[PDB]
Amino acid sequence: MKITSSNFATIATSENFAKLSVLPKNHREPIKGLFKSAVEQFSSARDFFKNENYSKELAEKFNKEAVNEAVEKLQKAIDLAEKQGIQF
Amino acid sequence: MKITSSNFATIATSENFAKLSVLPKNHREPIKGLFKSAVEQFSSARDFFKNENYSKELAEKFNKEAVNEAVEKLQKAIDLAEKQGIQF
């Protein structure tokens, strides 16, 4: 049975974790900590991955806002100068 | 003459800024500050836009590193459990 990041949430299930309670404690607790470490790490990666995209989305908007004001100041400048006879 | 973000670096040139020195000071300095404000804002947006991508590139790598360790811990856990007779 092979685990990939596409099938991870299918195996990391409460049902497989409960299947682990029949084992004796020497085996049960190391495997359980292994199971729980994998889930919390997978969830931190998912949490981190989607907030970074959110930030990027925001940042792109911000960038776009800045770029357009800059184009309108150049435009303004240029237009003001043509009125004063400047031959661009 | 119309300015867009694609043509901005073509108009924001030392040559157009120097063309602005023939004007009398009442017009020259407001247009010059307009010109220089537009360039520094455009450059801050360009600086910000490309560092954010760099960070994203790094972050994606980091995410990928985390996800794979998490898959290898689940895998490990699962494999350890099958050895102990667990019927998944």
Q: How many residues does chain A have?
A: 88
Q: Chain A contact for B48, CB < 8 A?
A: yes
Best of B74, B84, B88 to disrupt the A interface by mutation (most A CBs within 10 Å)? B74
Cα A12–Cα A17–Cα A20 angle in degrees, nearest 5: 140
Technique used by the depositors: X-ray
Task: Give the resolution to one decimal, in Å.
Answer: 2.5
Task: Identify which of A16, A23, A34 has the shortest CB distance to residue B76.
Answer: A34
Nearest-angstrom CA–CA distance, A34 and B50: 39
Contact B30, A80 (CB under 8 A): yes
Size of interface A-B (CB pairs under 8 A): 155
Distance, CA of B58 to CA of B54 (rounded, Å): 6
**DSSP per-residue letters across A29-61:** HHHHHHHHHHHHHHHHHHHHHHHHHHHHHHHHH
For chain A, how many helices (H) and strands (E)?
A: 3, 0
Residues 6+ apart with CB under 8 A from B64: none
Listed by start position, the domains of chain B span: 8-83
- Rounded to a whole number of angstroms, the CA Rg of chain A reads 28
Q: Is A31 on the interface with B (CB under 8 A)?
A: yes
